[PDB]
Amino acid sequence: VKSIKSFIVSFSNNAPDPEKDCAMVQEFFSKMEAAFRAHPLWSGCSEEELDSAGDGLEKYVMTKLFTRVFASNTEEVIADEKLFQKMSLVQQFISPENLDIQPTFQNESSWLLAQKELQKINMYKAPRDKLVCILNCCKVINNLLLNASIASNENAPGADEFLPVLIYVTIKANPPQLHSNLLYIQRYRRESKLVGEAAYFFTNILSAESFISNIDAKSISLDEAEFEKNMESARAR
Amino acid sequence: SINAKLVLLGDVGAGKSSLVLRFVKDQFVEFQESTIGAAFFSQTLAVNDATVKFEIWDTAGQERYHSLAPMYYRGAAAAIIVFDVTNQASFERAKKWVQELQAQGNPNMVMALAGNKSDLLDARKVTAEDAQTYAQENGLFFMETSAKTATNVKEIFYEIARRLP
Numbered sequence: 231v232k233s234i235k236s237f238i239v240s241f242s243n244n245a246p247d248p249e250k251d252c253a254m255v256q257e258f259f260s261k262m263e264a265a266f267r268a269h270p271l272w273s274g275c276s277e278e279e280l281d282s283a284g285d286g287l288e289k290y291v292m293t294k295l296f297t298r299v300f301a302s303n304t305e306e307v308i309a310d311e312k313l314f315q316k317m318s319l320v321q322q323f324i325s326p327e328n329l330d331i332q333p334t335f336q337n338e339s340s341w342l343l344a345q346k347e348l349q350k351i352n353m354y355k356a357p358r359d360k361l362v363c364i365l366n367c368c369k370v371i372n373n374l375l376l377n378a379s380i381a382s383n384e385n386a387p388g389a390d391e392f393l394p395v396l397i398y399v400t401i402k403a404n405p406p407q408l409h410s411n412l413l414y415i416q417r418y419r420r421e422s423k424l425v426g427e428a429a430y431f432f433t434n435i436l437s438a439e440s441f442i443s444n445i446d447a448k449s450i451s452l453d454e455a456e457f458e459k460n461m462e463s464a465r466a467r
Numbered sequence: 468s469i470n471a472k473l474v475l476l477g478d479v480g481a482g483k484s485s486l487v488l489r490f491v492k493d494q495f496v497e498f499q500e501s502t503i504g505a506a507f508f509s510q511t512l513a514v515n516d517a518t519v520k521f522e523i524w525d526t527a528g529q530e531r532y533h534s535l536a537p538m539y540y541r542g543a544a545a546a547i548i549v550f551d552v553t554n555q556a557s558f559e560r561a562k563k564w565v566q567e568l569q570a571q572g573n574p575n576m577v578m579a580l581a582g583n584k585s586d587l588l589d590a591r592k593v594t595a596e597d598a599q600t601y602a603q604e605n606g607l608f609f610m611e612t613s614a615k616t617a618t619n620v621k622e623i624f625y626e627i628a629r630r631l632p
């Protein structure tokens with residue numbers, strides 16, 4: 231416990247730099263995972279019980295460090311604003327058909343729930359809690375596609391459906407500070423946990439940010455003149 | 468012990484989603500650790516003999532998502548580039564995925580070329596030898612697969628596991 235508070239105080243005495251900060255934080259978490267493993271208190275117990283301790287430590291550490299490391303330079307804030315501005319125009323006119331997804335009552339009610347789960351990301355400081363919002367949103371989408379596969383006679387689209395639904399959900403959610411939220415998770419979620427399904431879900435939203443940020447007429451199946459008209463309509467609010 | 472990120476790449480209709488479905492469905496009988504999702508699966512395969520846990524990433528094949536691919540194959544232990552043997556253009560698209568991965572993927576990535584829908588005998592347009600020659604020249608291996616009949620499906624994943632470091 232002593233390690234942690236004196237880690238945090240003297241950590242916060244280093245001059246802030248996102249790369250050194252996250253390098254130092256990830257090494258600290260990684261050393262602590264090794265120590266939990268070796269501590270009389272965690273003998274014989276499962277990886278669930280060990281990850282649980284790791285997660286407690288992450289949240290404790292990251293709650294103190296949050297204001298120092300989250301959205302704390304101009305480059306990050308400028309990209310946050312730029313991405314928000316863009317989604318706030320595009321969400322006014324993008325349709326499901328633009329991304330080849332079917333707006334049935336069933337689909338829509340899940341998309342709306344996925345959107346609501348994603349919108350909670352700004353209620354939390356901890357990388358894990360922020361991430362869970364993304365995983366919960368992706369799980370809702372995952373389960374929609376799973377049930378569609380039992381209910382139907384054509385072969386499941388897989389990622390061909392999964393990604394555009396996520397792109398649509400993210401555009402509709404337009405969570406404030408998405409760019410900085412994603413970088414923060416990438417930097418500060420302990421590396422040993424950003425693997426497997428969680429990494430597949432997380433990379434998917436990362437790739438959605440990239441697509442959304444790069445949206446033009448062609449990428450959303452619109453011709454130039456219509457897209458310009460829509461963006462113009464959106465700009466007038 | 469051994470976790471291995473494997474990315475599925477190939478154009479629309481080649482068989483990405485079908486291939487991994489066939490793989491995981493047939494492996495059910497082995498009663499190993501597994502995760503079934505719509506676009507991600509994990510599957511532990513006994514290959515003689517240690518644990519390989521495949522973390523299998525399905526990708527959206529539409530050409531508008533192409534520029535996102537690097538985000539997926541980042542850190543990948545392995546890639547299967549799928550094409551439809553009955554479609555010349557799909558094979559051409561597969562060649563570009565290979566070139567791209569050679570240029571931008573981890574040096575250690577194990578690459579496999581899957582000539583899928585090998586079961587469509589009358590319709591085949593790409594030959595084994597033209598696909599095998601291409602595999603030889605670019606340091607990967609080629610295997611004809613059929614998600615439909617299961618032909619070589621287990622065998623492609625097994626063969627990659629054997630080539631892992």
Ligand SMILES: Nc1nc2c(ncn2[C@@H]2O[C@H](COP(=O)(O)OP(=O)(O)O)[C@@H](O)[C@H]2O)c(=O)[nH]1
Nearest residue numbers: 385479480481482483484485583584613614615
């Ligand atoms: N005959 C045959 N059909 C296949 C095979 N693999 C996939 N298909 C069918 O080809 C179509 C395209 O497959 P799909 O998995 O959805 O391709 P994807 O776009 O790469 O994800 C689907 O209707 C499959 O049912 C195969 O090995 N043989």
Ligand SMILES: [Ca+2]
Nearest residue numbers: 387388390484
């Ligand atoms: Ca698919």
